[PDB]
Amino acid sequence: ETLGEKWKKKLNQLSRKEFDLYKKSGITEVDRTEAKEGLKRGETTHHAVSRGSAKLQWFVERNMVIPEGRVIDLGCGRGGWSYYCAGLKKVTEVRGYTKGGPGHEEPVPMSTYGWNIVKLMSGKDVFYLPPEKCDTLLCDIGESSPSPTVEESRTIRVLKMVEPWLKNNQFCIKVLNPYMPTVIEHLERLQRKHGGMLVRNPLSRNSTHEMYWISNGTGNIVSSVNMVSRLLLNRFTMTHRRPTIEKDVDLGAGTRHVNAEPETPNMDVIGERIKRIKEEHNSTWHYDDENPYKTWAYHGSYEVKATGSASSMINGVVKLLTKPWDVVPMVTQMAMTDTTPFGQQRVFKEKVDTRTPRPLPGTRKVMEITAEWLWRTLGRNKRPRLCTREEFTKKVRTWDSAKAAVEDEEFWKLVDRERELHKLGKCGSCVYNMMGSRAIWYMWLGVRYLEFEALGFLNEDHWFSRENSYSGVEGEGLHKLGYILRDISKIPGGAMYADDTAGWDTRITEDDLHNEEKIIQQMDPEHRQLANAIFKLTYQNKVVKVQRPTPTGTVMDIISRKDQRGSGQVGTYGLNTFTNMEAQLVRQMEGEGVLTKADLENPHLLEKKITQWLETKGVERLKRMAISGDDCVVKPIDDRFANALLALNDMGKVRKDIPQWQPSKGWHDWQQVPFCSHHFHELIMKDGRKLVVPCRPQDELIGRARISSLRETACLGKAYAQMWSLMYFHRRDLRLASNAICSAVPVHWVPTSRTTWSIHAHHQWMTTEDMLTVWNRVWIEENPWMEDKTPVTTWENVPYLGKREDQWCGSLIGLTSRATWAQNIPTAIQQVRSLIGNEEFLDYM
Ligand SMILES: COc1cc(C)c(C(=O)NS(=O)(=O)c2cccc3cccnc23)cc1-c1ccc(C#CCO)s1
Ligand SMILES: Nc1ncnc2c1ncn2[C@@H]1O[C@H](CSCC[C@H](N)C(=O)O)[C@@H](O)[C@H]1O
Ligand SMILES: [Mg+2]
Ligand SMILES: [Zn+2]
Ligand SMILES: [Zn+2]
């Protein structure tokens, strides 16, 4: 009797209750919530049709099967394996066959990326089909049975059916029962002929001994099968472990043109950076022809140790003082952040490895005119300026590694050498990391300095301040954003629109880049030449480092791209604000009927009409906007803007979470308008004065504060408590939790570490000063929208949101557990105080 047979007898003896516990004990599982609701609403983009896409991805990620050419998918069902293959580098056609009909899954039609190369056929019994030529054979057929010999016949049947479909090609075949001796005998003969190996997918439930015969591998079937039997037997006795939750796959949207995908690198511009990386890592430098990059040019890899983690570190002090939130899913989903090479690669494939169609010639003309006008407007008072070593060094001080480098003369000597290459129109070492010795660290910081030197002026000199740019909100700060949205709401016209671009930085075109670059025209000759090196050699020819996991260990890939924004490069905020202002002006012109479909298609479009609209209405239309990077709030002259989608989608600025051609929905109540991850409420204090306050789902606030020595953990907790008291004092639970943290953390301990990296954060809470004096300075004294300067002497006079509004935005007020928490607060304070030690603490309400 095999171990698998012992496992089967035990599984069949389990009661219904203990079977439901065991089946998912310690397993990996994708969260199907979003996809199931999306499919229920009839959505055809992004969603995977079943858990199958995730299941196949696990194999593909690990190079166990690398689908390519003509893919055939036997028993495709709903199509999860097929729609996943459709977006892979080397796949040119996916033919899926499934039985369908009563008791069988039918193919679910979709518009995910590459749907156009997907051919799902129902009414196809694979056991009646003559084998076809194919480059990848996939098969996921096998119905379970309490009898293992019934499964044995089903498994041999599938094995005999698949075999003739194999001829030196890729495969991934389910083996329903691999533990029966005759199945092992059959697999051993199959491995001698076709190779491959048997692998267990962790996403498989414990109620099945299924394994997959994959083409890329070798190894001992008997040993691999028994290891699974042993794991599965051990899971019966093992104390119940909840499944490891992973984020489900994003299969994108739209048609795939395989010939449009590849990147053609400018080797004359990037060749030297590749040569130097190759030199520094010559001992492990290799060219991996099995790399997954479709739209990024690949140049080689080097071996590296793995960096990252599946989840975030939890803050113990704040968790202890926020007990009702242990049970809330959104709070724990915050900690769900996969930064492993597997996590990086998933994000790269779904978000970065895309190509935006060139905008039409009329769209390019409109953008060119708007850009020339906008830079002139932005440069009316200020002149561009070079930033310096002294400036960069000051900014760094206000990483310990960065402070060491800037104090080192060798770092500056390397910078000078690279600057001399930039002056000759050459780049030798300027690279950025998507996610991935001191020479490498110095080359990176030097790249960031040289970008800062040439383009730091846009941020440093406040080019996107509301005063300089009209639409900008730079230097404003969270507490001022709402007051600006309230002021914009006073402008008559349409609703306030707030459409987010799906991954903005990947939607930045070679045309956007050429328009952003136009600022060089206002620079002095020596500045012009340095900024022109950045734009041309580095921003329009990006050389990037990215980690990738392989069956033999982690590698660092060197990849390149001409278009898109370099997210790991300086000036991203300012360049995004500039292009978003321009794109929003173009969409306003279309909504006004100034810019037509005929204009967008016109190769010899006339500037006259656009120039008149900009010179006469431009600044007025800029004033109708609040633009902060990729994020915008637009209040147009009327609602035609909602239906104005031609120039927006043609520019490549496709809106997130909405079909391409569906009109936008806006708001007339400014307090419901989303902006920079927040919405803003207008409150009336006990004294009758009004306050405009920042707000967001309370679980996002708690969840974030719950992410990380003890002293550092307590100090970071205190920083979150003080930010809450200054910015989110109107949230009942946050003021109570803030008071609890400050009582539990030593009073003289000055908060350390940032609570956020937001450009809108001025960190007035990073102090030992009394929080009510800081509150008064922020909310009354320095507040330009507060006319009456009378201070507030008590927190009782610092207002809360209305009970219903506090509840709508996630408050737990009115729940029994929240009431128990409030009663149990002095106890939670004592527990943290006990752990910290015998220090000086104070009591807060
Ligand atoms: C516009 O203001 C904010 C926006 C965001 C996004 C954050 C913020 O970090 N949020 S986060 O931690 O949960 C988060 C982290 C990383 C990525 C995210 C992506 C989307 C949404 N959140 C993300 C903080 C602030 C501020 C907090 C306090 C402020 C103040 C003041 C007055 O001086 S400003
Ligand atoms: N004789 C047969 N011919 C064709 N398809 C069959 C079959 N016997 C079973 N099937 C189908 O095989 C499917 C297995 S489930 C397919 C899951 C899939 N890999 C995904 O990603 O969604 C079932 O839907 C079943 O209807
Ligand atoms: Mg927005
Ligand atoms: Zn360089
Ligand atoms: Zn709110």
Cα gap 210→8, rounded to integer Å:
12
Would you state the structure tokens that stand for residue 2, as one six-digit string? 């095999």
Is 99 marked within a binding site?
Answer: yes
| Strands 136-139, 170-175: pairing kind | parallel
- Return the structure tokens found at 268: 């004359």
Other CB atoms within a 10 A radius of the CB of residue 620 amount to 11
**727 touches ligand 1 (CB under 6 Å):** yes
Ligand 1 and 334: CB distance under 6 A: no
Question: Buried b / exposed e across 822-833, counting CB within 10 Å, b at 16+?
Answer: eeebeebbeebb
User: Which among 140, 453, 499, 582 is annotated as catalytic?
Assistant: 140
* CA angle (339 as vertex; 335, 345 as ends), nearest 5: 135
Cβ-count burial 523-544 (b if 16+ within 10 Å, e if not):
beeebbbbbbbbbbbbbbbbbb
DSSP label at residue 100: -
* Ligand 2 centroid from CA 627, angstroms: 49
Ligand nearest to C-alpha 693: 5
Given a contact cutoff of 8 angstroms between Cβ atoms, the answer to whether 188 and 153 are in contact is no
State the resolution, in angstroms. 2.0
The response to whether residue 783 sits with its C-beta less than 6 Å from ligand 1 reads: no
80 is in an annotated binding site: yes
CA of residue 100 to ligand 2 center, whole Å = 8
Query: Other CB atoms closer than 10 Å to residue 772's CB: what's the count?
Result: 18
In sequence order, which residues have a C-beta less than 8 Å from that of residue 769 and are 6 or more positions away? none
Neighbours of 716 (CB within 10 A): 23
CA-based Rg of the chain, rounded to a whole angstrom?
30
Q: Which fold has domain 1-256?
A: Rossmann fold (3.40.50)
Residue 510: both structure tokens together: 């070679």
- Specify the DSSP element, H or E, that contains 685: none
Contact indicator for 819, 750 with CB cutoff of 8 Å: no
Please tell me the experimental approach by which this structure was elucidated. Answer: X-ray
Distance set, CA 373 to CA 80, 269, 591, 637, 692 (Å): 49, 30, 20, 21, 34
Our answer to whether residue 615 is catalytic in this structure is no
Q: Is 424 exposed, middle or buried (0-12, 13-18, 19+ CB in 10 A)?
A: exposed
Distances from the Cα of 663 to the Cα of 493, 591, 594, 818, angstroms: 17, 12, 19, 41
C-beta 173 within 6 A of ligand 2: no
Which of 509, 483, 633 has the alpha carbon at shortest distance from 565? Answer: 509
Output the CA 766–ligand 4 centroid distance in Å: 37
Closest-CA residue to 453 (of 383, 520, 391): 391
Place of tokens 């979150």: 720
Every domain range in the chain assigned CATH 3.40.50.150: 1-256
CA nearest neighbour of 329 among 545, 34, 87, 582: 34
Contact predicate 491/634, CB 8 Å? no
Going from the Cα of 627 to the center of ligand 3, the distance in angstroms, rounded, reads: 9
Residue 787 burial (C-beta neighbours within 10 Å; 0-12, 13-18, 19+):
exposed
- CB count within 10 Å of CB 704 equals 18
Decide: 80 in ligand 2 pocket, CB within 6 A.
yes
Contact at 8 Å (CB) between 474 and 577? yes
Written as six digits, the tokens of 677 are 């991850």
Q: Which of 105, 152, 210, 248 is catalytic?
A: 210
